[PDB]
Design a protein around this ligand. Structure first.
Ligand SMILES: *[C@@H]1O[C@H](CO)[C@@H](O[C@@H]2O[C@H](CO)[C@@H](O[C@H]3O[C@H](CO)[C@@H](O)[C@H](O)[C@@H]3O)[C@H](O)[C@H]2NC(C)=O)[C@H](O)[C@H]1NC(C)=O
Ligand SMILES: CCCCCCCC/[NH+]=C1\NC[C@@H]2[C@@H](O)[C@H](O)[C@@H](O)[C@@H](O)N12
Ligand SMILES: C[C@@H]1O[C@@H](O)[C@@H](O)[C@H](O)[C@@H]1O
Ligand SMILES: [Cl-]
Length: 493
C-alpha cells in the first residue's frame, strides 16, 4: 500500500503519478470490506464495517438474491496494440514493470485478459499484414514482423510472469493481405474476393492457423479468436483504416465452410471462436443469421460486442433479447475507449466523467448477461497515439516518455473496481432495490462463495443505503455523489 501521488491537469479529478521508482499499489468476521474511489481524490481506499443482524428504517435497501444465478465471468483486461507496446517500451525497464504490475499483479488490478491484433490496425505506425507477398495462396511467406517478435510478444510474456491469475489471450484481425480483397487495399470498402468455400476464403482461414502456429512457437497460446474486427466497417465507403467487410450471411458462410472447419482440423481446435466483434445494435439480427444455421452454430462459442454505438442500442432489446434466444452462447464485450468521437478531445488527463463511463458500461453489461469486458489500448501517449490515421483516443494509462512518467487515470480505477474483485468463474446473482434510485449496482458471488457488490453513484447527491444479504445480515453504508464502491464480505462463514 503505497498511496496515489495525485496530479491535476485542470479537469474534474486527478491522475496518479508513477515513475521508475514509485507507483501506487494495493475481511475479518462478520465484517465487510469497502473499497472507495471519489472525484475528490480517493483511490480504491479500504475501510471496514460491521454486518448487522437487524435493520429498521425506510431508506434505500438493496437486497441480494443469492439463489438467482446468472452468467459466470470470464474476466477483464485490455489490448496490446503496437501503440501500447511502443508506449510501454519507451519507459525505463523499472517503470515498465511498475506499469505491467499496475494492470496484471495482485498489487495492482488483476487483469486476466489481453486482446491482441492480428497484424496492423489504426493503432499501428505502419500498415502491414503477415503475408504481404502477392498471390502467396500457399502462405509460404507468412511471417511475424518485429512489431510482434520484439514488441508485443515480449510484453505479453512479461505480463504473464507478473500475473496473479491465469491470463486469456484473444486475437482479432482488422484486414487480410490486400491481394485477397475486392479493392486491393488495406482500408476502404471491400471484402474477400469470391465466395466462402473458395480459394480466397480457404487461404484466409489458413492465415488464422498460421498466426496461431507462429504465436505457439513463441510459447503463447490463445483462449479465443474473433472472426473479424468490426466486419461492418468494410461495408463502408472510404472507411479510413484497416478493415474487411462481411454482411452477416457472408460471416455465417465463412465460419461454416472455411474458418470453423479449418480451426477444428488444426492443433488449435480448442481455441474458441467469437462472432460479430462489432456494435451491439447489430444484435439480435446477426446472432439469428449466424446461429440458426447449424453448420455455422456448431463452431461459434460466443458473440463479441463493442460499445461505440450503445446510445442507439438499449441493452434489453439487443443483449437481453440475444440471451433469451441463445442462452448458451456467451456475450463478451471486446472493445471500448472514450475520446473516439470527432468532436471529443482525445485525452483528458484526470477526467472523472470518463471513468464513470467505463463503470456504467461495465455494470450495464453485467446486468445483461455479458461475461467479460475488455478495454482498448493498454497505454497511449499524451496526444492519444501513435496512430497512422491520427484516430487518437483516451487510455486508462498515459505515458509521458520524455519524463519517464506514466499517469493512471480515473478509468484505470473504475476498471479496477471490477477486475480486481471479480475473478474468473465468479457468478452474477440477483439484486433488487426497494425504490427508484440513481445508483448502478451489480452483485456477484466469488468461486469461494463470498459476495461482491459494486455501486456507482451517477448523481451528485450522497445516497445512504443498506445492503441486505438474506440470512447473513445488513451492511449500513453511504454512497457519496459520483463515487464508486466495491463491497466484499464472506457469507458462507
Ligand atoms: C519518482 O516519483 C517519486 C514519488 O513522487 C519522487 O519522489 C518523492 O519526490 C518528492 C519530491 O521531491 C519528495 O517530496 C517531498 O518531500 C520533500 C522531502 O521531505 C519535501 O521537502 C517536499 O516538500 C515534498 O513534499 C518525496 O519525499 C520523494 N520520496 C518518495 C520516495 O516519495 C521521485 O523524485 C521521482 N523520480 C523522479 C526522477 O522525479
Ligand atoms: N470507432 C473506433 N474508435 C477507436 C477504435 C479504433 O481504434 C479500432 O480500430 C476500431 O475497432 C474502432 O471500432 N474504433
Ligand atoms: C527521493 C526522490 O528521488 C527522485 C528525485 O528526482 C526527487 O527529487 C527525490 O530526491
Ligand atoms: Cl473543456
Amino acid at each position: 500500500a503505497r498511496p496515489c501521488i495525485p496530479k491535476s491537469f485542470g479537469y474534474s479529478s486527478v491522475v496518479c503519478v508513477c515513475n521508475a521508482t514509485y507507483c501506487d499499489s494495493f475481511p475479518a468476521l462478520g465484517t465487510f470490506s469497502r473499497y472507495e474511489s471519489t472525484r475528490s481524490g480517493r483511490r480504491m481506499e479500504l475501510s471496514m464495517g460491521p454486518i448487522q443482524a437487524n435493520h429498521t428504517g425506510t431508506g434505500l435497501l438493496l437486497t441480494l438474491q443469492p439463489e438467482q444465478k446468472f452468467q459466470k465471468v470470464k474476466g477483464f483486461g485490455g489490448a496490446m496494440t503496437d501503440a501500447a507496446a511502443l508506449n510501454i517500451l519507451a519507459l525505463s525497464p523499472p517503470a515498465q514493470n511498475l506499469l505491467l504490475k499496475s494492470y496484471f499483479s495482485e498489487e495492482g488490478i488483476g487483469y486476466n485478459i489481453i486482446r491482441v491484433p492480428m497484424a496492423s490496425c489504426d493503432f499501428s505506425i505502419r500498415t502491414y499484414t503477415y503475408a504481404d507477398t502477392p498471390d502467396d495462396f500457399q502462405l509460404h511467406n507468412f511471417s511475424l514482423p518485429e512489431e510482434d517478435t520484439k514488441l508485443k510478444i515480449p510484453l505479453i510474456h512479461r505480463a504473464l510472469q507478473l500475473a496473479q491469475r491465469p491470463v486469456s489471450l484473444l486475437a482479432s484481425p482488422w484486414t487480410s493481405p490486400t491481394w485477397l480483397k475486392t479493392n486491393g487495399a488495406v482500408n476502404g470498402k471491400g471484402s474477400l474476393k469470391g465466395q466462402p468455400g473458395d480459394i480466397y476464403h480457404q487461404t484466409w482461414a489458413r492465415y488464422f492457423v498460421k498466426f496461431l502456429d507462429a504465436y505457439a512457437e513463441h510459447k503463447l497460446q490463445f483462449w479465443a479468436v474473433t472472426a473479424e474486427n468490426e466486419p461492418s466497417a468494410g461495408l463502408l465507403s472510404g472507411y479510413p483504416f484497416q478493415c474487411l467487410g462481411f454482411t452477416p450471411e457472408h460471416q455465417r458462410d465463412f465460419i461454416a465452410r472455411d474458418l470453423g472447419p479449418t480451426l477444428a482440423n488444426s492443433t488449435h481446435h480448442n481455441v474458441r471462436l467469437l462472432m460479430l466483434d462489432d456494435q451491439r445494435l447489430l444484435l439480435p439480427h446477426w446472432a439469428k443469421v449466424v446461429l440458426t444455421d447449424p453448420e455455422a452454430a456448431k463452431y461459434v462459442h460466443g458473440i463479441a460486442v463493442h460499445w461505440y454505438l450503445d446510445f442507439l442500442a438499449p441493452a434489453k432489446a439487443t443483449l437481453g433479447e440475444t440471451h433469451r434466444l441463445f442462452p448458451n452462447t456467451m456475450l463478451f464485450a471486446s472493445e471500448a475507449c472514450v475520446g473516439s468521437k470527432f468532436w471529443e478531445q482525445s485525452v483528458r488527463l484526470g477526467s472523472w466523467d470518463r471513468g464513470m463511463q467505463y463503470s456504467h458500461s461495465i455494470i450495464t453489461n453485467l446486468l445483461y448477461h455479458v461475461v467479460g469486458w475488455t478495454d482498448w489500448n493498454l497505454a497511449l501517449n499524451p496526444e492519444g497515439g501513435p496512430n497512422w490515421v491520427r484516430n487518437f483516443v483516451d487510455s486508462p494509462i498515459i505515458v509521458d516518455i520524455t519524463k519517464d512518467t506514466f499517469y493512471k487515470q480515473p478509468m484505470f480505477y473504475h476498471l479496477g473496481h471490477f477486475s480486481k474483485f471479480i475473478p474468473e468463474g465468479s457468478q452474477r446473482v440477483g439484486l433488487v432495490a426497494s425504490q427508484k434510485n440513481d445508483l448502478d449496482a451489480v452483485a456477484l458471488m466469488h468461486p469461494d462463495g463470498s459476495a461482491v457488490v459494486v455501486v456507482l453513484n451517477r448523481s451528485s447527491k450522497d445516497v445512504p443505503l443498506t445492503i441486505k444479504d438474506p440470512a447473513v445480515g445488513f451492511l449500513e453504508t453511504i454512497s457519496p455523489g459520483y463515487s464508486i464502491h466495491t463491497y466484499l464480505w464472506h457469507r458462507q462463514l
